[PDB]
Structure 1
Amino acid sequence: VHGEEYAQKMQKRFHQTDIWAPFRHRYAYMYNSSNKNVKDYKQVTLSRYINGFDKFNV
């Protein structure tokens, strides 16, 4: 809506395209930079005690 040139200019980040760095708000550090629990807070609270919240890996 701002124009093709405006869209192209706002969609470009690095003049040199050799380096790859996807946009991220923060970089993980815990669990050797890993997300140990990928779920909601209530989801984890239920999964720790209430059955059925874990879909398993098989």
Structure 2
Amino acid sequence: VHGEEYAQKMQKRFHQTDIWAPFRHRYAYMYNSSNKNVKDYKQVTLSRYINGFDKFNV
């Protein structure tokens, strides 16, 4: 709406594009930079005692 040039300038982030640097608010550290609990807090609490939360990836 402001301008195609304005949008292009806003989106461009690097002068040299040969390097890929994804934007992250923070970098994972625990569990070898992984997430153990990919769930909500409620799911994390309940799934340890209630059936149906685990989807049996087989």
Shorter-chain TM-score: what band? over 0.9
Structure 1 unaligned regions, length at least 5 = none
Residues 3-23 of structure 1 deviation map (CA, whole Å, 9 limit, x = unaligned): 000000000000000110111
| Map of 1:34 onto structure 2 | 34
Alignment size in residue pairs: 58
**Secondary structure of the residue that 1:49 maps to in structure 2?**
coil
TM-score, normalising length: structure 1: 0.95
Structure 2 unaligned regions, length at least 5 = none
Structure 1 segments of 4 or more deviating over 2 A? none
What CA distance in whole angstroms lies between the structure 1 residues aligned with 2:9 and 2:16? 14
TM-score, normalising length: structure 2: 0.95
Residues 3-52 of structure 1 deviation map (CA, whole Å, 9 limit, x = unaligned): 00000000000000011011111110000110001000001111011111
What CA distance in whole angstroms lies between the structure 1 residues aligned with 2:51 and 2:15? 51
